[PDB]
């Protein structure tokens, strides 16, 4: 009957904690999510969050190059998802820390994941606020490094993205 | 306990907002001071969690919004949408809670008495900010130049301001404004790119015309020389390129655009040039201090980024001023942000002991606290 | 807390030796202060004295060619300071022996030093009352020349200054 799907505010509880800043000398470092994935249920009436890996700002010391270049090595090539990224780009003119919304829909991902995540895409885009940019991305090769992410934020202010000079 | 105590910085002088944290020399956000809201339904069907779209969101959402700048010239002409600019600055651009974090704000030059008090009001009654200060914008760049006395020019967006200052006080008999700047220079730039047949109209092209204004436009030192030097070159016409791969050509427009700030007669006002307005402002200052204003002309603001503009200003003002006296102009590297940078440095100072503009004291001293928590 | 640095009465001890004289036969020759330096304390709260060559009226015999000329071989090339002077100058109709306030702020010095120091101008200028002249000093190469120690007083001296012809 064309019911659609709905976002439960569990997706918004993690968005709020991710979005807003707190104490700089610890809680910006390890109480901010830098990446998260949001997923359709098996029921398919709702969008949820699951174990689909969240990583913080400090975890560059514990493990990775940066959190989002770890996240693109963990994206499902055969399913469509939403993601969220707090993208840090740096220059002398501005230190831009923008929150970005991501619709992930691989060429290899199935048509009846696609059409469901695509029709509910702009319900979640109205629930989030203090997002600056959005990506519609359709395979690993559209997301495979920071330099290909910086193009879709655009301007000329992205002289560096995620601590890596471009 | 110890934490890098993130005191907040916001600045607006002529319709360009700058914001960041106390100690940043580079802003975390810079946006044009426009708010838009729906003409009927929202940007996507039904209501959102907001249906008010500020700066970048107002600029990128054509066909749907009615819009205002709360600062349509050099004075704030609305407060009830200026509230929503600060709200979006704190909670969406900077992404902080101002509830517990002190604020440095700037008063825009040549504004009525009550403008800093209505600013003080909304910060203590609506945002609940624990301690704050409203500085005069110009003095922060005067102090960053290395003056306590001198004359400051803003030429941010929607006005050029001319502010003589003696020992931190701006002279109220001699302050001046010229209501043409970097805003209307974008529109004059497309009024002359019309001569090439570029039918520009959209915000998506105003993006590209802004990018020509920043990356391609320069002031002439001698307008006849720069025309002759261009015509005697084998290149004067040059391509710029749009992000989608399409190409547009610009030539002598690069200096025909800036030049109408040195004579508003070209865009068709009666008004005198920025050098003439600077020396008229100096001439209306007191005879025992005019001597030192000659040497201390601080160029701040977004439109001071054109090559040749300070160099031309020194060459122009030496024809106006009696040539026994000597002229000196100063235009910083970060001249684009200089007033907010001096604000960020003021924001970081903790010595509140002779201020006392706080959410205790506000409730005795009222909106006018700002005039009884200074010497 | 968005609020400029506060000066306290430690500076008024060093300026006692300026604000009043004593008898010229001995006491002025050991107790008239000719040059002294002040600095921002890097706890970032007050302007203190910098105890690096407090110059007087004995020392001029031993080594100090001009008082300020020995002080211009301390003053930092690319950082801001405050100073005082007791200027000894002969005019056409009076010998003047007058107190001067110096703002040292080199043209190339950091904005983040300049702004804190420059906004303290009011605070120090209230406390050092009994000054009659103000030297804006924009670097070394705006005060290494002996004449502009007279020009920055208003120039109208036109006889002698510091024991040198003017």
UniProtKB/Swiss-Prot annotation, chains A, C:
Keywords: Acetylation, Actin-binding, Cytoplasm, Cytoskeleton, Disease variant, Nemaline myopathy, Nucleus, Phosphoprotein. Changing residue 35 to T: In NEM7; protein is less soluble when expressed in Escherichia coli. Pfam families: Cofilin_ADF. Gene3D superfamilies: Severin. GO terms for biological process: actin filament depolymerization; actin filament fragmentation; actin filament severing; muscle cell cellular homeostasis; positive regulation of actin filament depolymerization; sarcomere organization; skeletal muscle tissue development. A motif (Nuclear localization signal) lies at residues 30-34. SMART domains: ADF (SM00102). The modification N-acetylalanine is found at residue 2. Interacts with CSRP3; possibly two molecules of CFL2 can interact with one molecule if CSRP3. This is Cofilin-2. It comes from Homo sapiens. The gene is CFL2.
Swiss-Prot record, chain B:
Oxidation of Met-44 and Met-47 by MICALs (MICAL1, MICAL2 or MICAL3) to form methionine sulfoxide promotes actin filament depolymerization. MICAL1 and MICAL2 produce the (R)-S-oxide form. The (R)-S-oxide form is reverted by MSRB1 and MSRB2, which promotes actin repolymerization. Can be mono-ADP-ribosylated on Arg-177 by SpvB of Salmonella spp. This modification blocks subsequent polymerization and leads to cell death. It catalyses: ATP + H2O = ADP + phosphate + H(+). The modification N-acetylaspartate is found at residue 1. The keyword Nucleotide-binding applies. The modification Tele-methylhistidine is found at residue 73. Keywords: Acetylation, ADP-ribosylation, ATP-binding, Cytoplasm, Cytoskeleton, Hydrolase, Methylation, Muscle protein, Nucleotide-binding, Oxidation. It comes from Oryctolagus cuniculus. Gene3D superfamilies: 3.30.420.40, Actin, Chain A, domain 4. The gene is ACTA1. One of its GO terms (molecular function) is identical protein binding. This is Actin, alpha skeletal muscle. One of its GO terms (biological process) is actin filament polymerization. The modification N6-malonyllysine is found at residue 61. The modification ADP-ribosylarginine is found at residue 177. Actins are highly conserved proteins that are involved in various types of cell motility and are ubiquitously expressed in all eukaryotic cells. Belongs to the actin family. The modification Methionine (R)-sulfoxide is found at residues 44, 47. The lineage of its organism: Eukaryota, Metazoa, Chordata, Craniata, Vertebrata. It is found in: Cytoplasm, Cytoskeleton. It is an enzyme of class 3 (hydrolase). CDD domains: ASKHA_NBD_actin (cd10224). PROSITE patterns: ACTINS_1, ACTINS_2, ACTINS_ACT_LIKE. Pfam families: Actin. Its EC number is 3.6.4.-. Residues 110-123, 358-370 are annotated as: Interaction with alpha-actinin. Polymerization of globular actin (G-actin) leads to a structural filament (F-actin) in the form of a two-stranded helix. Each actin can bind to 4 others. Interacts with alpha-actinin. Identified in a complex composed of ACTA1, COBL, GSN and TMSB4X. Interacts with TTID. Interacts (via its C-terminus) with USP25. The keyword Hydrolase applies.
């Amino acid at each position: 009957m064309a019911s659609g799907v709905t976002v439960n505010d569990e997706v918004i509880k993690v968005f709020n904690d991710m979005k807003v800043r707190k104490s700089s000398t610890q809680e910006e470092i390890k109480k901010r999510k830098k990446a998260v994935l949001f997923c359709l249920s098996d029921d398919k009436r709702q969008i949820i969050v699951e174990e689909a890996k969240q990583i913080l700002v400090g975890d560059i010391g514990d493990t990775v190059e940066d959190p989002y270049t770890s996240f693109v090595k963990l994206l499902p090539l055969n399913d469509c998802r939403y993601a969220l990224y707090d993208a840090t780009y740096e220059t002398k003119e501005s230190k831009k820390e923008d929150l970005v919304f991501i619709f992930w829909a691989p060429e290899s991902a199935p048509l009846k994941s696609k059409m469901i995540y695509a029709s509910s895409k702009d319900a979640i885009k109205k629930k989030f606020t203090g997002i600056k940019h959005e990506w519609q991305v359709n395979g690993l090769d559209d997301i495979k490094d920071r330099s290909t992410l910086g193009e879709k934020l655009g301007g000329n202010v992205v002289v560096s993205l995620e601590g890596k000079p471009l | 306990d110890e934490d890098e105590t993130t005191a907040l910085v916001c600045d607006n002088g002529s319709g360009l907002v700058k914001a960041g944290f106390a100690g940043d020399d580079a802003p975390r956000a810079v946006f044009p001071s426009i708010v838009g809201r729906p003409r009927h339904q929202g940007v996507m069907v039904g209501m959102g969690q907001k249906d008010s779209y500020v700066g970048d969101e107002a600029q990128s959402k054509r066909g749907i919004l009615t819009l205002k700048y709360p600062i349509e010239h050099g004075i704030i002409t609305n407060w009830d949408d200026m509230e929503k600019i600060w709200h979006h600055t704190f909670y969406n651009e900077l992404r902080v809670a101002p509830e517990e974090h002190p604020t440095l704000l700037t008063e825009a030059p040549l504004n009525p008495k009550a403008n800093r008090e209505k600013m003080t009001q909304i910060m203590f009654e609506t945002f609940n900010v624990p301690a704050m200060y409203v500085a005069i914008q110009a003095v922060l760049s005067l102090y960053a130049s290395g003056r306590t006395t001198g004359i400051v020019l803003d030429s941010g967006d929607g006005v050029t301001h001319n502010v003589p200052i003696y020992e931190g006080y701006a002279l109220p008999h001699a302050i001046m404004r010229l209501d043409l700047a970097g805003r209307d220079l974008t529109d004059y730039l497309m009024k002359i790119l019309t001569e090439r047949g570029y039918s520009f109209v959209t915000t998506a092209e105003r993006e590209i015309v802004r990018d020509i204004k920043e990356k391609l436009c320069y002031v002439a030192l001698d307008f006849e020389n720069e025309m002759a030097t261009a015509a005697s070159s084998s290149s004067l016409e040059k391509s710029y390129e749009l992000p989608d791969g399409q190409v547009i050509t610009i030539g002598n427009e690069r200096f025909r655009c800036p030049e109408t700030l040195f004579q508003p007669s070209f865009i068709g006002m009666e008004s005198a040039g920025i050098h003439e307005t600077t020396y008229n402002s100096i001439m209306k200052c007191d005879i025992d201090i005019r001597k030192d204003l000659y040497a201390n002309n601080v160029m701040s603001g977004g439109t001071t980024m054109y090559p040749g503009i300070a160099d031309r200003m020194q060459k122009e003002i030496t024809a106006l001023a009696p040539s026994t006296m000597k002229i000196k102009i100063i235009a910083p590297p970060e001249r684009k942000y200089s007033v907010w940078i001096g604000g960020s440095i003021l924001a970081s100072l903790s010595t509140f002991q002779q201020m006392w503009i706080t959410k205790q004291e506000y409730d005795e001293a009222g909106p006018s606290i700002v005039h009884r928590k200074c010497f």
